Design a protein around this nucleic acid. Structure first.
Ligand SMILES: NC(=O)c1ccc[n+]([C@@H]2O[C@H](COP(=O)([O-])OP(=O)(O)OC[C@H]3O[C@@H](n4cnc5c(N)ncnc54)[C@H](O)[C@@H]3O)[C@@H](O)[C@H]2O)c1
Ligand SMILES: [K+]
Ligand SMILES: [Mg+2]
Ligand SMILES: [Mg+2]
Ligand SMILES: [Mg+2]
Ligand SMILES: [Mg+2]
Ligand SMILES: [Mg+2]
Ligand SMILES: [Mg+2]
Ligand SMILES: [Mg+2]
Lengths: 109, 45, 58, 39, 51, 161
RNA sequence: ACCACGAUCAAAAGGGACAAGCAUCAAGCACGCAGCAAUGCAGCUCAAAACGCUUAGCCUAGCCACACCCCCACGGGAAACAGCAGU
């Protein structure tokens, strides 16, 4: 009722930043193979409005649907950056991390 | 004789390539080829 | 849950966790480190799963 | 083949069946041009 | 209330994590002390042979 | 730039009283009287001191990138003179690919160290092409014509409006 | 309802989903974005199959498409049973 865009909330990876104020994002969903009964990743490209140009190629972002499309292919906007590429903050402990190791120890605070 | 057939086929390939290239700029609206454009002969040494 | 987007990530944080995004914009974080897969299933069912009464009504 | 390869290739694609001398029809009408015998 | 309970469980697990991290920190401190002792002996011997 | 030939070897740079020795001993224990590998070791040590937070940790990804970059420079210097050495060309190409893989991992994990490594080693990180296909003559000519035709279409539209 | 409040039904428009074979159809050639606009950027799709050729009414309480042909029908060909019976 609040939007005409089908995909309301979607998480994706930024794969392009060559458009002005627009981020090209790759979104994967799990689709069942009817014959093999195994789930495979299916990819779809979304253009997300990024007014401040804070998105970098490789970061994981959350996209929220616009009330109406602002362009032919731009139907979403950047709600937040879930994982900045190479600058991940462990949501569980709130500490910076590099892969599977703590850059700052949780005990440090 | 296979030389004559092969060179005729190469000529026809070049003609087809030129025809496709012409189709593109004709559809784009340009009456003539791009200014200074000349189709190279890519299928002949 | 065919219409729910499920996405997986590997070796990006020191600990494993789940995050659920809701239509209102609320986010629910579930730490799963030191838990068994049954415990994770039961926890997510409890916090965000339709109870058996609602399913029977449906 | 692995499961990934089977998913990529998809279900087997049986080639279309070959039409025979009758072109997939029970019978055909014809006009006799010449009669002979073969060995 | 379900969200509140989930947050409470997260805090409980966080406290358990802090305890585990403290234990591991102490144990690793001791192990690092022993390994550094071996390293210091090796460095001393190597420096002496160079001299 | 290479270390000066007067610099001491990595193994004889912290010996006590190494500065109180004769000039002949200094020459004998310098890079001048050694092979290229000791010079490469000195280069690696200098890069580690300049870049990484813990120069003693040769186990980190940044240390491995520094070591492989020094090796890549050595292979390039070899191939400048040895232009027909196919084995060393292969080694250089594999080393470049491996360094790219390590740089990609570093970018994904630690962006600050990635930036520091890229600046220190003069490396320009490049994203891989999306498609791998031959750029044969027909395709190249056709793409050139399409770019041109777009340009005159733009000019004509600007004139129209 | 018919004083409308609104229900039911359902177009146009926006978002998503949606047949088969051929990759010896592998590149399409303007197919994107930003700005109130002027205009600026050079982008967009694609081997996870774009673009293209060929085949077929479909997912059947039924649905879609067509109504002699030129997709359309101002106009032209020309004079219409793919309504029932019938030739
Ligand atoms: N075609 C590509 O450019 C490309 C790009 C990324 C990934 N891939 C992956 O490579 C695998 C092979 O795909 P295909 O059967 O359609 O190619 P293919 O063997 O049928 O050859 C067609 C084109 O794809 C290229 N190609 C072939 N193998 C590739 C590979 N491993 N990586 C990149 N390019 C490759 C070839 O250079 C050729 O230009 C697939 O799993 C695909 O996902 C292919
Ligand atoms: K018609
Ligand atoms: Mg409609
Ligand atoms: Mg053929
Ligand atoms: Mg192939
Ligand atoms: Mg038909
Ligand atoms: Mg009609
Ligand atoms: Mg009739
Ligand atoms: Mg009729």
């Amino acid at each position: 009722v609040r939007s005409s865009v089908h995909a309301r909330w979607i998480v994706g990876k930024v794969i392009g930043t060559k458009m002005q104020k627009t981020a090209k994002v790759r979104v994967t969903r799990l689709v069942l193979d009817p014959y093999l009964l195994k789930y495979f990743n299916k990819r779809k490209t979304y253009f997300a409005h990024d007014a401040l140009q804070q998105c970098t190629v490789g970061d994981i972002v959350l996209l929220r649907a616009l009330p109406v499309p602002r362009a032919k292919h731009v139907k979403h906007e950047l709600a937040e950056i879930v994982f900045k590429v190479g600058k991940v903050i462990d949501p569980v402990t709130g500490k910076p991390c590099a892969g599977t190791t703590y850059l700052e120890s949780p005990l440090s605070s | 004789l296979r030389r004559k057939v092969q060179e005729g086929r190469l000529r026809r390939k070049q003609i087809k390539f030129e025809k496709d290239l012409r189709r593109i700029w004709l559809k784009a609206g340009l009456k003539e080829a791009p200014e200074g454009w000349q189709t190279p002969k890519i299928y002949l040494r | 849950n065919p219409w729910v987007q499920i996405m997986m990530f590997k070796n990006m944080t020191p600990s494993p966790f789940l995050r659920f995004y809701l239509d209102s914009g609320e986010q629910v974080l579930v730490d799963v480190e030191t838990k068994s897969n049954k415990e994770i299933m039961e926890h997510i069912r409890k916090i965000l799963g339709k109870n058996e009464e609602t399913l029977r009504e449906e | 083949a692995t499961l990934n390869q089977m998913h990529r290739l998809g279900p087997p694609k049986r080639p279309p069946r070959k039409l025979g001398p009758t072109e997939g029809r029970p019978q055909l009408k014809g006009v006799v041009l010449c009669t002979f015998t073969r060995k | 209330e379900l969200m509140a309970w989930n947050q409470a469980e997260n805090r409980r697990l966080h406290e358990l994590r802090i305890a585990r991290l403290r234990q591991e920190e102490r144990e690793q401190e001791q192990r690092q002390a022993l390994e550094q002792a071996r390293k210091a002996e090796e460095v001393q011997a190597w420096a002496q042979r160079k001299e | 730039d290479d270390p000066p030939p007067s610099t001491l070897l990595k193994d004889y740079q912290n010996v006590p009283g190494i500065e109180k020795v004769d000039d002949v001993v200094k020459r004998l224990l310098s890079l001048e009287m050694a092979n290229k590998k000791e010079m490469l070791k000195i280069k690696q040590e200098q890069f580690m001191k300049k870049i990484v937070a813990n120069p003693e940790d040769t186990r980190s990804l940044e240390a491995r990138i520094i070591a492989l970059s020094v090796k890549i420079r050595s292979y390039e210097e070899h191939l400048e003179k040895h232009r027909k050495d196919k084995a060393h060309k292969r080694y250089l190409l594999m080393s470049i690919d491996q360094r790219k893989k390590m740089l990609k991992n570093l970018r994904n994990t630690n962006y600050d160290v990635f930036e520091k490594i890229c600046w220190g080693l003069g490396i320009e990180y490049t994203f891989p092409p999306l498609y791998y296909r031959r750029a044969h003559r027909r395709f190249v000519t056709k793409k050139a014509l399409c770019i041109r035709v777009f340009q005159e279409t733009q000019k004509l539209k600007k004139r129209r409006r």
